[PDB]
Amino acid sequence: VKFQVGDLVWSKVGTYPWWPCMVSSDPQLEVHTKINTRGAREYHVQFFSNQPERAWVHEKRVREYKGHKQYEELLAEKIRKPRPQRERAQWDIGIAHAEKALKMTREERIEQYTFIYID
Numbered sequence: 001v002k003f004q005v006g007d008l009v010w011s012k013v014g015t016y017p018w019w020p021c022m023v024s025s026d027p028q029l030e031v032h033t034k035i036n037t038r039g040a041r042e043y044h045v046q047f048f049s050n051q052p053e054r055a056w057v058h059e060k061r062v063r064e065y066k067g068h069k070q071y072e073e074l075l076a077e078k079i080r081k082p083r084p085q086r087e088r089a090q091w092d093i094g095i096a097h098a099e100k101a102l103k104m105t106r107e108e109r110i111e112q113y114t115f116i117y118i119d
């Protein structure tokens with residue numbers, strides 16, 4: 001286990017670009033990490049954005065978030081894909097939250113950002 005609740009990370013999921021997140025406990029499993037049905041470790045994350053979104057993400061697609069400028073180093077992991085405006089706008093909002101979260105303590109981030117789940 002490389003990440004704990006409140007850690008800031010980048011997550012790469014499906015068709016989405018590397019996205020700023022906060023590791024969090026799954027609202028049902030009450031764990032932030034697990035071994036999946038293929039035998040691989042995953043982490044539970046909240047994506048930073050205007051709309052609350054969460055996912056279980058494979059450990060190979062989770063990276064420590066040190067700052068927004070790391071994005072260039074992640075793409076590298078010339079021909080470049082364009083940045084679709086609608087997604088770019090949502091990603092910019094997410095990054096603004098992650099940049100504010102970076103200035104907080106782990107306890108502050110947990111208090112400030114942990115989602116509330118309603119049945």
Ligand SMILES: Cc1cc(=O)n(C2CCNCC2)nc1-c1ccccc1
Nearest residue numbers: 013016019047048049053054055090
């Ligand atoms: C980055 C990302 C990956 C990703 O897998 N999902 C899923 C999560 C479950 N619900 C469907 C969408 N949403 C996002 C996302 C995009 C923009 C704003 C916020 C989050």
